[PDB]
Amino acid sequence: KSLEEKYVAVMKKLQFDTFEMVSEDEDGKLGFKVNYHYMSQVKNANDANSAARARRLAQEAVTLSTSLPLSSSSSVFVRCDEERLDIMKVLITGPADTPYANGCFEFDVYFPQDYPSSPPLVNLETTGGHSVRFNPNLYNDGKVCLSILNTWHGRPEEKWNPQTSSFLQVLVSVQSLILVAEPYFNEPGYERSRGTPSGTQSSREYDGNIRQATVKWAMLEQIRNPSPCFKEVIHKHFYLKRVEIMAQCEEWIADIQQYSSDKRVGRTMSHHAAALKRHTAQLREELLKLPCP
Amino acid sequence: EIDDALYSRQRYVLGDTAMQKMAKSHVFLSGMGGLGLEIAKNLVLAGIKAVTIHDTEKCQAWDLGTNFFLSEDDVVNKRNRAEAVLKHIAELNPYVHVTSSSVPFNETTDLSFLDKYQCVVLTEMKLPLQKKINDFCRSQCPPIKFISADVHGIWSRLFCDFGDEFEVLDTTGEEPKEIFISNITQANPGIVTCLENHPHKLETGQFLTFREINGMTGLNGSIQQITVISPFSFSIGDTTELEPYLHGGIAVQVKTPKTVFFESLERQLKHPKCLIVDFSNPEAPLEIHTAMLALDQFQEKYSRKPNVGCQQDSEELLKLATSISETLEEKPDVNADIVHWLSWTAQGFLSPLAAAVGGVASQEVLKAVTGKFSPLCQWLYLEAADIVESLGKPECEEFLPRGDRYDALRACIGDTLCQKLQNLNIFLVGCGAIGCEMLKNFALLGVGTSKEKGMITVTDPDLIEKSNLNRQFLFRPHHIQKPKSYTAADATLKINSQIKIDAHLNKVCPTTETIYNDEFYTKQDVIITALDNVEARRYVDSRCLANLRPLLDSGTMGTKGHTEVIVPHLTESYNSHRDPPEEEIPFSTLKSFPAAIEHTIQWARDKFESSFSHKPSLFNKFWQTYSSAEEVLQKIQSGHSLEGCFQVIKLLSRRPRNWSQCVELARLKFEKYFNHKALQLLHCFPLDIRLKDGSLFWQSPKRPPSPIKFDLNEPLHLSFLQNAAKLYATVYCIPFAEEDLSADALLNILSEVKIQEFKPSNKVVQTDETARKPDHVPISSEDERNAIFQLEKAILSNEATKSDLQMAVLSFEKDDDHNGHIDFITAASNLRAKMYSIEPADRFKTKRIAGKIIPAIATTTATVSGLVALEMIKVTGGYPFEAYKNCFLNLAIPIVVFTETTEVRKTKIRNGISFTIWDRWTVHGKEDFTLLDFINAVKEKYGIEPTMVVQGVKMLYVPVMPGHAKRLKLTMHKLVKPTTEKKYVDLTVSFAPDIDGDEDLPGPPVRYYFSH
């Protein structure tokens, strides 16, 4: 619990901060010092900014600086440009007891011109070159599907609301819906297989694949190739949680080996377990080589 | 036969039944002043078969200020007024047989020759002669419709008399309404309840007909008269004897004919039925009628109009008005100011008011020969007293004539206001019909004719089309496919050679903001918009609000029109209005469950776009992104997920190579669209399937689809096949001839084509009316290997050249009939309607709806242009807020409503300080001036401390942002990093609310200057 308290104390000071992601030349043409998803959208945005687009963003900044979620199980970290508020990056640590447990994911956030009349645009960058569709609502291309973002089917009350919806609500919905312990059932049609042996078997297949992919990208590629906006955050988080990470990966290796005897899916479990062991050895080496922040 | 290519916009207003009656009507028009010329022009543009203009007066120099066809040569030759303009009028519409006459009119004149005319219009005629003619006209069998119109200075009079009884065939231009029935009870009277989500929107006493009613099957085909109970219920009479209701039911509104009564002109002078146009003065029209009757009696008594500034004439006119007023039924008090101004401006002639009255009178004439709308009953008085009321008591020397062409307007508004008008700089956006009429009004008023300052700038990018000749009267058949702005500018100078006009082809948009910068807007004094869309209106309104310049706006939808007046520091801007947008049809309703013909039309339009605009563009883009099909094969074999590769492969594998294959593809598309879809939907939802509550799924608004069987003998099937084949051949660049379109060839070609047997898939059907179109379905491995095989076969068959990998893209042309886009859309929509038992539409309605063609007529455009030009005078004169009048009119009823423009709403910010949308705070600084200095200066100047500073999209300073308190010490130039072009910069500021946790209160925009 002392580790939890230290994580709360340290990462809280690192939850919200500025970062120089955008610079302009002598004429004013935009040039970016970090990777970003909406390059064309940013470069094509006009200067006819609505006052609401600034007031709402300032109020959201106050709300984020005051009440960003924070726990060693799951936390939200936000970085915004020193000059442009409409561009942001969001780093989320996966809640425990899920295939995303302790995995850190980087998101690119853009605000459209008519914001807050329309939901903002969020894209995922931790897909590992679009290799893995980490969630049924999170396609490998980086698309994020949510009712509040109008990118997922739902009732109007679940949709975007310029008067009541907020970015904090979006983050809470992301944590509560995408990073769940049963991502396989998020897909339509698959949710009705919940409780059936075939549905549970397919869920275990998907969860093993997601676990190995998370270890590969959301942990190993993050420590090896950290994003500059979250470099200190990622190192501190992995150093603080390192023992839990190795324990969790050994537990996952033990869990996936339980289904290696399966004939429908067992070979996939064997392949994912071999990949997980390789990535676990690599992660253990990296954590042993990781200096104390 | 109606020339649709010329008349379509007017047809969408009037209808074929009315137009086929106007083709057999003769109209007699007397008096060729400004008002008579406007009426004649509107009637000729409308397409009346025969018009007989008549006038006995000769041309004078005074006439040039009211007539836009006369020339100085006409005055030199002393030609007859009617014959001097007969030649020019005929050019407006070659289909119209215009004639001229000059028979003297007086007491001894024989009126028997008038019987050959259906309608008679009299202008600038003595009252007793009008009385005699009206007595003769209404006594004929059938009665001759009588209309009288007059303009005296700033006062106008319009009168109608359509006989003892007039049979109106349609009380309004609204389409008949369809009401879906939710429940009906067996009661006396039976209470009918519509679907609870849609309002009743009907009135007691109307007639409805019923169809598709289950349970009470006897109500099918019956006609009932309803009584409104609630905004969602009504009663149609006793239904207890009927069967028990089950479900369904649709009621249709029936347009019953209505009879309107009129009275003789001589008796109508007492107790006149006057149309109220200003509800703040419900008794003004009666006073105006009394004053005009007194003026006519003065003309009878003295054989001359009152002289301007003559107190004796004004006193005599007041005495006559007082004597006349007591004879009326109501005995109103004589308005001294109205009589005084009528005496003051008796000899004047205000052109914009004349144009507005001419438009209204022409609409009444069109109603007279068709009965398409409820006519005026009976008097209508339009005022312009606001123009001269703000002048106080100007001297008579301002109004005395001086010999130039502007004596007509000088006697109306005085010399100083005319001088102000001549020095105006007006930026006219859009050169449509409203723009052309406004340019004609400018030419008549002499706007910008001063050699020192006056200048008019008109900009429009569109070219002249044949359909524009119907209402944009400045153009001619030989001006087709030439710029609107250039042609209008070159035509305007003929009306008034002293005018100075500049024409531009630029579209008004942010991309062209460089030309129309703030310095240009500062130069202009008034901005007038004749736009046809909303986005450009909002952009122009924002620019005018930024530059603090008045704006005049107007728009016409058929017989409805409105005028918007915006004045700095006085009225709200156009952006302050946020009326609800067009309601989108639900995606599930459009794709799967259409209820009305409009849904099928929209579906056909979307299908056409996706088939000939979207997918060919994607094909071209895909084959330009990747060079060769072999490269695509190598990439997909290595797992590369090229953007939409499988769809492009599917398009490539189905590419036709000759006309026969195009016909086969069209046949397959017909089968897929109109047989397989219905079978799939019925497989998902059988006819007897029931919901969770046990109610039948197939009930209103949903309708059960029926599979259609192909049959080449039916004209609709042949039309669809021909259109689809031609469009696909054009897209695939397959050459063809008209002989290939013969039904014999199509039958011979299709005889060898096998029709694939249908199989039911299990695709999810979206029944949610709140859902939208889902994104791409994940491609299965089977589809992947099928695409691989298809493109490998294509490569083997050498179908991989650049010609194979490019397709022509078709734009949705709608004005031309030979391209066949409208034909294809009509055929597809009618077939889809036949699927769901929806009543089929026709080609013209499909053209109107699919093309989003806004109905328009010349009369409404002329009226709104006259009103806008009238308000332009008030804007130029700088009159107080009370003088400006927003207008909304609908000539169908007819109804004209004047209303004070919306007052600007002060927004309280803090501690009693308030600002308006026109406000903009300013701060002057220097290079060592800092952000903290900026905050201190703002707080000192306006008594309130800023809480955040924003430079457009860039954030300058927000307290909650870490490390931004350091920016207070930074110099303004360094933190802004501005360009040397601008001496200033615009920032957005917000302030602290009274309550903690509330959003920062938005302040007015702030302009900071980098130097003093």
Ligand SMILES: O=P(O)(O)O[C@H]1[C@H](OP(=O)(O)O)[C@@H](OP(=O)(O)O)[C@H](OP(=O)(O)O)[C@@H](OP(=O)(O)O)[C@H]1OP(=O)(O)O
């Ligand atoms: O592209 P869309 O305009 O949305 O229309 C598509 C398209 O039909 P067409 O190519 O004939 O216009 C599909 O065919 P493909 O291009 O994918 O071959 C067809 O899919 P099927 O071949 O499976 O019938 C689908 O129909 P559906 O969604 O019922 O499967 C239909 O959609 P709509 O006609 O409803 O637009």
Ligand SMILES: Nc1ncnc2c1ncn2[C@@H]1O[C@H](COP(=O)(O)OP(=O)(O)OP(=O)(O)O)[C@@H](O)[C@H]1O
């Ligand atoms: N942003 C803009 N800047 C300048 N002119 C514009 C702009 N948007 C529209 N227009 C002009 O508005 C005019 C509209 O004219 P109008 O309403 O009489 O109908 P139309 O476009 O000529 O014909 P129809 O609507 O019947 O096809 C067009 O001539 C077009 O050039």
